[model samples]
Target: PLGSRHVACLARSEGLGFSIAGGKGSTPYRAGDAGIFVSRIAEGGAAHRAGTLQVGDRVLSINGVDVTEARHDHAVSLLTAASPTIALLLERE
Candidate 1:
């Protein structure tokens, strides 16, 4: 469960689905990617104030360490170990 600060409220549902395009046909969606997907940002939040974290930004690393292969739970453990603001490496596209 997420703490109070980490809790996210959905303002709307876009009903979006993952799809792969560019070649002949679309491919089936699969997990195990090397990036973090952020679909929304809370208003007046720390991340929003930082001006670095944003919707659709893919978090590639944390504290200069690559987290590409890190699982969801593992990443959460790593990030939660440190208190206060955490440094993140991200990709915009």
Candidate 2:
């Protein structure tokens, strides 16, 4: 991987497949892409349904921890380190 990363496409079955900067394996500043991004959403994985999360969506925060500015890998850690029940803030693209 380019570096470490985490996303906010939290789903009962699958999570929000979605980024950040800094640290040893940090991403370049030019990279202002994402904290987490949703890709497939198919295979019965479209957020387990529809109208909730979608492809190209951005995960801004999880459990109120604003990963929007956090490192990709670190952000993922934040999400993973949380309880099974999670609340995420997303920004659609």
Candidate 3:
């Protein structure tokens, strides 16, 4: 096992947002579950520029909200709700 989990808090201002890139079927992370993975980060986008999100980072939360068990769609909504500035809490995959 890893000695310690690495965490990264990222943000995005505008452009295309990220998406959940993990899980499948009924056990999908898109089903409002913890360990939300960052499958893709928009090229040259706010998140890409923020320099916090990795290709396989697990989304922990946003702002002060607990997305540890939030749906993928809901998480995406919450993540993009705040435009021109978005805060997030993430971890390694």
For candidate 3, what is the TM-score? 0.66
Off by over 4 Å in 3: 1-17, 22-34
Q: Give the number of the best model, judged by TM-score.
A: 3
In order, what is each prediction's RMSD in angstroms?
12.4, 7.7, 4.2
Which tens-of-lDDT digit does each residue in 1-93 have in candidate 3?
532244444544434456565432225544664456787878877667667667767666667677766666676676667555556666663
lDDT score, residue 93, model 1? Answer: 45
Report the poorest 10 consecutive residues by lDDT, candidate 2. Answer: 16-25
- The per-residue C-alpha lDDT of model 1 at residue 68 equals 54
lDDT of 2 by residue, 1-93 (tens): 233334344543444333223322354333555345544455454344544655555656778887666666776577567466556666553
Instruction: Report lDDT per candidate.
Output: 0.44, 0.52, 0.61
Worst 10 residues of 3 by lDDT: 21-30
Q: Is 2 or 3 the stronger prediction by lDDT? A: 3
Clashes within 3 Å, all models in order: 0, 13, 2
**Each prediction's TM-score against the native?**
0.56, 0.55, 0.66
